Design a protein around this ligand. Structure first.
Ligand SMILES: C/C1=C\[C@H](C)C[C@H](C)OC(=O)C[C@H](c2ccc(O)cc2)NC(=O)[C@@H](Cc2c(Br)[nH]c3ccccc23)N(C)C(=O)[C@H](C)NC(=O)[C@@H](C)C1
Ligand SMILES: C/C1=C\[C@H](C)C[C@H](C)OC(=O)C[C@H](c2ccc(O)cc2)NC(=O)[C@@H](Cc2c(Br)[nH]c3ccccc23)N(C)C(=O)[C@H](C)NC(=O)[C@@H](C)C1
Ligand SMILES: C/C1=C\[C@H](C)C[C@H](C)OC(=O)C[C@H](c2ccc(O)cc2)NC(=O)[C@@H](Cc2c(Br)[nH]c3ccccc23)N(C)C(=O)[C@H](C)NC(=O)[C@@H](C)C1
Ligand SMILES: Nc1ncnc2c1ncn2[C@@H]1O[C@H](COP(=O)(O)OP(=O)(O)O)[C@@H](O)[C@H]1O
Ligand SMILES: Nc1ncnc2c1ncn2[C@@H]1O[C@H](COP(=O)(O)OP(=O)(O)O)[C@@H](O)[C@H]1O
Ligand SMILES: Nc1ncnc2c1ncn2[C@@H]1O[C@H](COP(=O)(O)OP(=O)(O)O)[C@@H](O)[C@H]1O
Ligand SMILES: [Mg+2]
Ligand SMILES: [Mg+2]
Ligand SMILES: [Mg+2]
Lengths: 367, 367, 367
């Protein structure tokens, strides 16, 4: 009997069995419902268009994300997503193995309580545990000291840890992630006459962003250079065979991470958030936090993010410090691998919240 | 079988085996307890953060001194400190060798009685002896006549001795030591905008004081000179890489030894205390006491203390006398070396207080 | 010709003319700058959005406090605030009347020197004086003996005074005030799903705190009672008409004054700080200090603070003492009224620092 590890993000669902090196089932976290009447008699009108099945036939479906900034907004569809994960992707009986789940820090308590109640009463798991994503990202890297910058589709958070002890008063959360960048890309592609509006057009723009975008080392000089020559342009082919050309948007779209004012948000960039999280720690801790910054999440996968973040932090921190940003090649799956490591430890076997405790202490047993 | 010599101060613990020329184990006398919850499963949550181990990871610990003005205020942590000394630093079995301890003069009797009871019942030593620090400082210097000014972290005392005979009615005690100077430095560094509050920040200010401070030959002229030029300033680098600059505080901080009114204390300086201890002696003794003043303790390590004390005593004593202050290079370890000399004498073998006497005569056997 | 009294705090500016019973102009100490481009031609783009004008249209402005823990961090905006006070609120010529200012104890000297230079060179006042807030709070109460606990938006300090003589070595300063409580309220409102991030959202949370919070007599029993019934809940209406409900946060937020560990700060509560300030005084003074404790500042306006502080001090002080906490109804304006009383005394006319002295003795004339 091995635990199941299900990392539940705003954009993707990563599921698998503890002990594996990689998640065996990764599919987008969408639920689709048809927007047209079915006319041919003799077909099967499936209700659960979940994940890649909904992605494949998004032409006749309207797509909805049940998780928004890490908070579940539609529990009915989230239950469908969980059922899909347990029965069609992993193809296991959930009542046999305990399940390890993840949740972003500084989340409302009702979210976790509803999650626990749904797991214990609908799917009937023997036990569970809910862990923070940022501490698992540190488990994946085999280290006990460092500050983790996790950025996914819903929310970015920084969690500093020193010698295994957490520093909860220094945790920062920034609701600026990949979905905001996709929407900004949709907005600024209108400058060239490309109009994207539909839910499927959103998934097209997301695919454009994931391939053509990169982070410039400095923004103003790169702007001035781009206005002079056309070698920055690139071409992308739409599903129907139409060809579009993208220019300085390639480095304009991800710049909003460091300048949120591009999105109309009154906030500070990821570099400034990292620096301010470090500065809330004790003076003796700061050197080891500067010396080890961990990148996690898919949003940190832009080419050149490490150099840019190192330059910003070096410009902010005193000249004596040696800023070292750690960007593993597999940092898109750091949280899942960390959870896989955590669930297999012999020490962790006492933290399982069995159903007998839940029925004894109510939903608040998780806290 | 050789005796163990443990000099137990308010700030540091000096331990070793009799016959050595120097203490083999010197570590600060602090006990730390974590102030944060441990979040990573798979680490060891040690309870005894004692000495340099607590000093190394003071960022996540709160630090407490179990001895205050030479009187033990927390016996539970003092027992931890003694266990650490016996088992992790010296790495000996305490039940094999007798232990020689030290205690400041004019201390309450309950302190010594509790110390003896803890040693005999918890650690089970074959024998012990408790000696005054000031007479051991005279043993270290190979002399029988002179007045000893011992100043450590908790309390300053002067003990005059003539031809081996003590003069107990002339003993003076002044509760003004290194810890008071560290707190005064913390207070007056706020004039420049440097705020130090935490327990670890106290250890940072102590390190600043131990390197940048010195004693001016005269205070008012040095003030007037410092206000004219900036060559007195010096720079110090904080743990995180920030740089601070200190000015006249360098000679303002140790001036409180000679002017306790800087600390708000209604008392007299160390020079005046020394003079008044001398004047309580017989007229025939005073010449040999003026001719030999012994400096002991770490607080007397400021550059220029000898010249200042000689000037003060010369201004107080009659012009015929030749004041001679003795400042050995190793006066930071005078008490321990004196105890090492004392415990190795063949004459001293009769003063051991064995356990059989203790069980016969109660805790009062020490007196 | 009557003096002007300007009490300059971290959160609010209280200004007026000496001889009045109350400050005629009280407005928040904020400077706002627009974060949007102006599109309508024919409007006036004012630069100085200061005080209530910035508060009224905070939707399109970003708000910044130029004073942080009683130390001015942005002199350019502080000059704007002072100009606003002198010309739009009081509507007087500053070069006609002398100005009396206030400053928190244990402040860096450069702050006061820059303040004096700005007043004498930009606004050209005939004279000035800078006074400590805590001694003015004692003037307002018509008393010469007592210990004053002043707590505002930036810093809390306790200053004991006996028979008119100050005891500067017993002064304590605690950087924990109303702004920290507002930030803690923002943090712990996330438990219910309420997210407040913007500068204007900070002013919304401050208004929530000022009305719904109170201090429980004991914390654990009140917790246990709150978990049983919902009668502790209350509702608050947001600017746009949305309704939020607050529960045990009402007495959780101000508890951080007595348990700073809630904020992640390694410090002691206000009761412990008061007790430790008393214990640094002479034994003969302590009875009259216990018998008269003065509350000053807006942070001490929570319902039930007097009973809680009396209970804590009674539990700390010996059973013989009768702890009496004095909480005037108008203690939010104690410092200003005390300054108004002080400036009108005939004795005080010799302490004015005229411009002729300043030009003669440099900025250090204030000290
Ligand atoms: C971009 C795509 C196809 C493209 C036709 C592929 C080719 C390659 O692009 C062009 O030919 C550029 C051309 C264009 C028109 C004028 C111009 O000075 C420059 C370019 N653009 C147009 O005609 C606009 C007009 C428009 C509609 Br209506 N609303 C909008 C909202 C904002 C902006 C513009 C518009 N147009 C018909 C569209 O966007 C349509 C709706 N877009 C799509 O179906 C997406 C899924 C794929
Ligand atoms: C001194 C240190 C770092 C420093 C930042 C290193 C640099 C080099 O110093 C400066 O930049 C000087 C600057 C300053 C500010 C205003 C001014 O007219 C002159 C100097 N001082 C400040 O901003 C004060 C403000 C302050 C707090 Br809040 N409470 C206090 C209590 C008393 C006095 C002042 C304050 N400040 C943020 C601190 O002290 C912080 C808490 N101190 C530390 O973390 C320690 C461990 C190390
Ligand atoms: C509190 C306010 C309005 C409210 C909407 C008024 C109504 C009355 O509250 C609700 O309906 C509660 C609901 C909620 C959602 C899930 C849940 O299990 C319980 C409650 N909360 C939400 O949807 C969160 C989601 C969220 C964002 Br995004 N980041 C966050 C950071 C931390 C926590 C949560 C979040 N949400 C949209 C907000 O906070 C927005 C940004 N808040 C505001 O604009 C402020 C100025 C006023
Ligand atoms: N190679 C890539 N380059 C840039 N962005 C990417 C890349 N791969 C994924 N992303 C972005 O990462 C976001 C979500 O990634 P992920 O870390 O899985 O988030 P979640 O934690 O919500 O599952 C997507 O919105 C996508 O835009
Ligand atoms: N080189 C130095 N210069 C100035 N002060 C020092 C120096 N070394 C140590 N001290 C001070 O001496 C104090 C304690 O020294 P020590 O004599 O070991 O005291 P104790 O008898 O309590 O062990 C410390 O508080 C430290 O501030
Ligand atoms: N009625 C009230 N109840 C609770 N807190 C209050 C009340 N009125 C004001 N405050 C708090 O007092 C703080 C500042 O008050 P004040 O004493 O004017 O400070 P300052 O000295 O900085 O002007 C504000 O941050 C506010 O949160
Ligand atoms: Mg994720
Ligand atoms: Mg000593
Ligand atoms: Mg005030």
């Amino acid at each position: 009997v091995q635990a199941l590890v299900v990392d539940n993000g705003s954009g993707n669902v990563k599921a698998g069995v503890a002990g594996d090196d990689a998640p065996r089932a990764v599919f987008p976290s969408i639920v689709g419902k048809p927007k047209n009447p079915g006319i041919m008699v003799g077909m099967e009108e499936k209700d659960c268009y979940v994940g890649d099945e909904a992605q494949s036939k998004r032409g006749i479906l309207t797509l909805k994300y049940p998780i928004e900034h890490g908070i579940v907004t539609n529990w009915d569809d989230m239950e469908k997503i969980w059922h899909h994960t347990f029965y069609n992707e992993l193809r296991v009986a959930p009542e046999e193995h305990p399940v390890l789940l993840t949740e972003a820090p500084l989340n409302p308590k009702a979210n976790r309580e509803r999650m626990t109640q749904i797991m214990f009463e609908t799917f009937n798991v023997p036990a569970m545990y809910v862990a923070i994503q940022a501490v698992l990202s540190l488990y994946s890297s085999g280290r006990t000291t460092g500050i983790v910058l996790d950025s996914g589709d819903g929310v970015s958070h920084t969690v500093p840890i020193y010698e295994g002890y957490a520093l909860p008063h220094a945790i920062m959360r920034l609701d600026l992630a990949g979905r905001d960048l996709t929407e900004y890309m949709m907005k600024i592609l209108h400058e060239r006459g490309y109009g994207f509006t539909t839910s499927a057009e959103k998934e097209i723009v997301r695919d454009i962003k994931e391939k053509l975008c990169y982070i410039a080392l400095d923004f103003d000089e790169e702007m001035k250079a781009a206005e002079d020559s056309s070698d920055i342009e690139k071409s992308y082919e739409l599903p129907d065979g139409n060809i579009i050309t993208v220019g300085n948007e390639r480095f304009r779209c991800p710049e909003a991470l460091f300048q949120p004012s591009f999105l109309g948000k009154e906030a500070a960039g990821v570099h400034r958030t990292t620096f301010d999280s470090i500065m809330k720690c004790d003076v003796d801790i700061r050197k080891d936090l500067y010396g080890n910054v961990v990148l996690s999440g898919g949003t940190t996968m832009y080419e050149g993010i490490g150099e840019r973040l190192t330059k910003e932090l070096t410009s902010l921190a005193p000249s004596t410090m040696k800023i070292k940003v750690v960007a593993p090649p597999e940092r898109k799956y750091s949280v899942w691998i960390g959870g896989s490591i955590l669930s297999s430890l012999s020490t962790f076997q006492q933290m399982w919240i069995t159903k007998e405790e839940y029925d004894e202490s109510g939903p608040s047993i998780v806290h």
